[PDB]
Specification:
The structure is a homodimer.
Chain A lengths: L3 H17 L2 H6 L1 E8 L7 E2 L1 H12 L3 E4 L4 E2 L4 E12 L2 E13 L5 E7 L5 E2 L1
Parallel strand pairs in A: 1-7
Antiparallel strand pairs in A: 1-2, 3-5, 4-5, 5-6, 6-7, 6-8
PDB class: isomerase
Keywords: Alpha-beta roll, Isomerase, Steroid, oxyanion-hole, Intracellular
Assembly: dimeric
């Protein structure tokens, strides 16, 4: 189970991979039985093909960067604030998000929860 | 059940109450049978009696400040998450801690669960 320092590293790596847009490398970070709730409040996505499809839809000119430190626990979990910059039909947008993640004993993402709503979106 | 906007206001209010150190007002924001996990990974404390004891031990010695360090992220199912920093004293030393709280509210606008993400990696003296 990743240590607190290791959680900080894995969560920051996740943001770096979103920022470059490497869907394959993102999906590799997930465990077989992982779930993604994004935005939190929506039904969970599960299944490796389904998680890949989610990232392909979302990322298929998106940029993302941490906007504060990763907060990590001693039980393989963490939470991080970040901002996503995207273009909607040629229009620059930004979205503030916090992801909460639980990692398994192999260092793979078991659960991803992305908190945000329209109150967090600007143009 | 608070809307997204209402979650933003409640969670911001919470930080205001921590910042001023109003233990009773904090405890009244929680559901009577709420759970707190702080830091997340430690066993849950249950109920306003235990939660009050927790906030009294954390705040009742004064000198705590707390402020949001980014916007509250809110959902449409009465939940939210926020980044903040707490400034504290350790026997005369200034301390600071970066935290993210996640909260779920009940159908009465009270905090049903709170999870506070941080560890010593987030602590600076």
């Amino acid at each position: 189970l990743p240590t607190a320092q290791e959680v900080q590293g894995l969560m920051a790596r996740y943001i770096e991979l979103v920022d470059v847009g490497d869907i394959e490398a993102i999906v590799q970070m997930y465990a077989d039985d992982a779930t993604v709730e994004d935005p939190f409040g929506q039904p969970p996505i599960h299944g490796r093909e389904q998680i890949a499809a989610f990232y392909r839809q979302g990322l298929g000119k998106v940029r993302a960067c941490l906007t504060g430190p990763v907060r990590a626990s001693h039980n393989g979990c963490g939470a991080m604030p970040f901002r996503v910059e995207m273009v909607w039909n040629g229009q620059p947008c930004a979205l503030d998000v916090i992801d909460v993640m639980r990692f398994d004993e192999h260092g793979r993402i078991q659960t991803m929860q992305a908190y945000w709503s329209e109150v967090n979106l600007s143009v």
